[PDB]
Amino acid sequence: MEGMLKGEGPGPLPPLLQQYVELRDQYPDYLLLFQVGDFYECFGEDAERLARALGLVLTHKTSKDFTTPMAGIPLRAFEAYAERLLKMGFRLAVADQVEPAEEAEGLVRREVTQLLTPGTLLQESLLPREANYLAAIATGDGWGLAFLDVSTGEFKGTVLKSKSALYDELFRHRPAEVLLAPELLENGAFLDEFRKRFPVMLSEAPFEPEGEGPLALRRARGALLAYAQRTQGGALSLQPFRFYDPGAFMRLPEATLRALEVFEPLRGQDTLFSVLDETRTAPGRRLLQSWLRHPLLDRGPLEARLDRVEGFVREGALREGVRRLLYRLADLERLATRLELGRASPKDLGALRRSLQILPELRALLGEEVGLPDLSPLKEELEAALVEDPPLKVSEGGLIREGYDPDLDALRAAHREGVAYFLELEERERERTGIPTLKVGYNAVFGYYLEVTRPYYERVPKEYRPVQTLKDRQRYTLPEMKEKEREVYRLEALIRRREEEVFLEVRERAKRQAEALREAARILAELDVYAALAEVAVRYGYVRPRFGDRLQIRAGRHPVVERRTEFVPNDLEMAHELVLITGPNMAGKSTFLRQTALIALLAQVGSFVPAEEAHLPLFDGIYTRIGAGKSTFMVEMEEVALILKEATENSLVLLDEVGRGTSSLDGVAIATAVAEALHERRAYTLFATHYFELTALGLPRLKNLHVAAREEAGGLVFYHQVLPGPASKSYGVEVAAMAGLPKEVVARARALLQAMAAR
Amino acid sequence: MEGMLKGEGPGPLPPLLQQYVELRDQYPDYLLLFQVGDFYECFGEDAERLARALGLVLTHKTSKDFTTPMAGIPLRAFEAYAERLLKMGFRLAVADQVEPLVRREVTQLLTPGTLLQESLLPREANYLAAIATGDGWGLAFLDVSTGEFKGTVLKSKSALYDELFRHRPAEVLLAPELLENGAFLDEFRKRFPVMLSEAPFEPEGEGPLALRRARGALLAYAQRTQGGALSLQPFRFYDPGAFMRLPEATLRALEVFEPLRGQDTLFSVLDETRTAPGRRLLQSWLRHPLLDRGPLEARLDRVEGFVREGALREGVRRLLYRLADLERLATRLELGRASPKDLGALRRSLQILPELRALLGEEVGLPDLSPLKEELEAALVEDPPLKVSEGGLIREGYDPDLDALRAAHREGVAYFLELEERERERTGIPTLKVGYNAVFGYYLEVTRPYYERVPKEYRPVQTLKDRQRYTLPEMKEKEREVYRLEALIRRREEEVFLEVRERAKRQAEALREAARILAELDVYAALAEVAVRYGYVRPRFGDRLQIRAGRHPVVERRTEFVPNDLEMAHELVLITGPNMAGKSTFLRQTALIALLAQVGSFVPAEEAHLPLFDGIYTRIGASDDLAGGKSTFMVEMEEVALILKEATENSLVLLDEVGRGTSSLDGVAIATAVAEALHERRAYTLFATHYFELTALGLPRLKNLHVAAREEAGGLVFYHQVLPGPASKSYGVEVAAMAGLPKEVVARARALLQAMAAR
DNA sequence: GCGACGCTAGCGTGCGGCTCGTC
DNA sequence: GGACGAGCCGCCGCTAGCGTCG
Ligand SMILES: Nc1ncnc2c1ncn2[C@@H]1O[C@H](COP(=O)(O)OP(=O)(O)O)[C@@H](O)[C@H]1O
């Protein structure tokens, strides 16, 4: 069994290393950072792991019995070191010195304070502005999926019917850490797939149900709670749990978000989010992200969001003001969580103090209708307790302003006089002794002292007690000092105790405002997004979309591509029609299909869109077969299957070259069958193809569009007008030619084309 | 800004920072790492970068009239950060404090393609490339770590890239004409993501102007790095036409050196060498396969040698295990950079050399370096320490002078161990210590308790927390002596070390000759090991290609591979069949076999009679990876054009589905003209395609082959057997069926398929 | 016939703070 | 000749080695 450390030597394990091992083996998969004084240390293999991982120095902690390897980091840089460690894949186990030193039974009590897992981080220097989720998956009457953002308290979940939907929902939440139920972990088949499709860190957790509802959900939830309650090291700050339904929002499958680069890019470029997000606050960025993750289906609310956006678009003044003020707004939502969790530092409070000071100016600028809570009381007391620039930890310098604590002002009082004492003494001695240069100094090793140089050694009085000798200076002590020096130390010792209580007292004051803090967060967060979205409209020429059943876009732009190029706008009019798009490659097709999707996605999120006029329907889902079973033809078909099993007459469907990857024959066939399928389905379908045949089909709701090329001076020039009607001819041979194919070889190809043409 | 440091304050740069800025300014395009004690420091704006790129602790360097930000890395961790900093595109300038107003100067210059330090280099060659212009392109490569100096003159920018790619340079030097040509540079970067450095191009040597100029850039640049004359072997001018052509398309398609992601390259599978020189040799061969049968048959003979002599093969492979890189070691010695540790490595190698000569025999021609090995065994500790000062380097009894000094020194230490035993044996203080410190030298140390038992013959010099250190009259001389010696011991030991290092440096050639012979042996012996392990057979060369049961060398190491036969002879061999059956793999094994053979290795087959191809030109698919404007089609055609302009009747061409990516018509049209062009070309063409039309062109040298699939259990199972003659079916619809396409859609497709047969 | 306490010099990650040598 | 390198002690806590209760 386990209970032994690494290295060389016989005899027993020292009292300390003993305590080290005892905790170290309770968290087997965590790197234990042992708190020994002003350092976090690791011994044995764990010590070696550290040293190399962080390039630290490898030393040893020797004792009678044996000597073991040692590696440590100064607490000062804990988080600094933590971050690096985490990014490498380690879960940290922070073992701190609970009870103070001065009142310990020899060996200071040490227990693991908190656990640092990638998806349960609370340290604000370790978290992104974006939401950081922990996700749990379980089975038992369908698939159970739940999320928890330990830093904000967001706690939600749902149950999905397929393994497809689970992954979709999971992928739109971009979970930073996943808990897999027993069943799934065992099943080597599943796990492989999951681990392959979601390269996120996995972790063990008990899936004993919790609360009420579908068995699956109760297990996933219990898992989250169990795991997080362990890493926080105490009760969690949870928000009402949401058992939501993803059928109430627009469907954004994984293949759509990826292909559409909503959140992640394909060519290390920009993404829809990147381009759109100009929020100033973090909760704001979070909200906006939430909105994209699940676009609305309901006309009313969207037309609510669009009004407020339009508001700031008009009120340029106001818009720039609210944004000017939000620049200074801190993450109240998270700050409120840290407070409730009793983790709020003076730094946090200082920040809270600044944020709350902004409130009134926002109130004025927008009017008392904003509904912002009145925290003026809390705001003020903070300004009256904290220093203009709050320190990091309490025990150190001044945190509480002078004149706020009677008990503490008397302390700084006594200390000022006490220090002045030693100053007075210097001059008293410089006279009695006649030694002009005599200094009165201090230092940790010997305390307050009287200093005299060599030229005056024979001039020092009997009374002076030698304390320290130096190259050419000697330091003495008088009895008086000895006393007054301890009066200073006792004051200082009392000053910390109190300055820290006053802090804790004031903190708790802010902690009773957590809820108020939280609602201000929400209001300010929407405020942030609304102004942001408007900021984006103005800067980039977006316009308010109008919803209806007919989609009529006028001078369209792909919101991301136009960001890095003179983009040629284009039109579109669809209505449950089948719209084939033909024309030479490099012409514009796909930069057209994608454009359509994004426009739709922005509108149904409450944002203005990149066009001149846009009349859009409320799509129940955007499905794509763009870009991306051993073969390529099978993979693409697997997708068409999916798309075909969920698209409704209210889905926007985008097909790019479906039918490629096989024989010409099976090509057209499958394409035709599929095109006919989406046609009956009655969904809005854009199909970019190379089979001109599909354009001639005998379908009632079939429309045709095309892009073109003009063979001019230097070969072919591709314009991007998406003109009406089908493409006339193919430019393959022309392109090949342009690509350098030997002129005789091209000529031969032209002859063959014209021969086959003659039937 | 020269003389300017990003900081706050008026007054001049203090002495130190003044030095810093002086060097900093000499190597502008580099990040200057300044030594300060046990750290490498950066100041001003540079310090902010160092801090940024490595996420360090930004702080400040302060003097009365100026304070600037600083950041640094431990003198030790250097080579570890250098790597990160190098990979980040940083060029480093190292300044070391000339071994004791210090005197700091720029020791090295760390650059991607000029690295000399072993811990920063790969076993493989590391080149610095330069390209110039002047009747064709000038290409010259240099590997400062080896001395390898070669070059050639290319006629087309197309051939240029190729040769530049075969070598995978680490850093390139473009001539000014090229740097100014906005289009080229815009293209070069896009196609060759690698560090580009500036460097003079004043011609050097003889031959073409473009070569001499490139050759000059190299020399000029590299010397700046290795601060002084370079150690290089005779410039080797070569002709790419003297070897088999291996263009970048083929090198990637075939994954000779790098995988298309999803590990395992021909090289990794093939590479089984035990030394670096060997790995470099074998890589060299793979890079330029031979045309001439003479040499090839010579290599095959050597390989067979070890396939026969198992005891010899196994004995040599054992001995070479971990054997050091004599070639690089020789260079370091010649460059005057060899570390004590290096000499240590060298002797180990020399100790093993005698055993290898036993096994092989005089035939081989290894140099007898026993004298050098006896010397190194006589002077170096059984673990020289490059890092630990430079002392504890020469062993006792090697050099009398040094020996006498160390001995004298030691007595002193003894004395200061007697004063200890003697004193406490008079003062009763069995505690009293005799330690030393730089500040005062030697002393006496007494703890707090014994101040009452401390005699007056003493003279306190320094007091500490729990103890105080005293002095004595009869102790100074014995200090000013121990030191005068510790100094001399350094002065002398370094002399000897240098003397020793020099003796090794005089054997540079013997070391290079040894390295080289062993490299061959290592290679032949490894090509044998591989043949024996995976069943490779010696190939025979003749105008007909005949491979009996050949397997893809790389693919098989991962699965049960089905071997296949092939009989070609200047024929157009089409391969049809369902995807997922094996068409593309087949083309690739055929190509890899041809390569292994013309590299002098055995092949993965039973019988292999192969023609000596002049080049292997592939068009094995991928396309659209820059993934920009260019349609995949266009990219594929450019490649085809390349082949048509290169392929001769003695070329092995592999066309994989050429024609896809456009209209079905142009598709077949282009695909037929190409197939025809290659037919008349009379080159060995393997064309996997889906256009059955090609299957029936009826050309005199046309031939059919195909793979198939059966209908087992549920759907389709692909057997991997390449049968003679064409396929007659397409399993598109069948596959969509397995894909999960709605039965109706599938049925609709089939109805369509046949409905076309009425044609 | 030795378990139990007390006193207390000393080491040690990384790194402020203190000291000392020189123009 | 007050200021600038350049380098040692010790932090906070735990231990081992010594006396000693009796
Ligand atoms: N309307 C447009 N305005 C400006 N650039 C465009 C437009 N449409 C396409 N492009 C650009 O032309 C190139 C080819 O477009 P893509 O949609 O991929 O074409 P297709 O399927 O037609 O080949 C891309 O670089 C794309 O960004």
Ligand SMILES: Nc1ncnc2c1ncn2[C@@H]1O[C@H](COP(=O)(O)OP(=O)(O)O)[C@@H](O)[C@H]1O
């Ligand atoms: N000779 C062979 N022996 C064993 N597996 C093979 C062989 N040839 C191909 N395969 C496997 O068959 C699958 C399809 O082969 P691939 O060459 O891609 O075929 P294609 O162009 O016919 O689709 C791959 O998984 C590949 O690794």
Ligand code: BEF
């Ligand atoms: F990118 Be497009 F569909 F060719």
Ligand code: BEF
């Ligand atoms: F790889 Be094969 F051409 F599908």
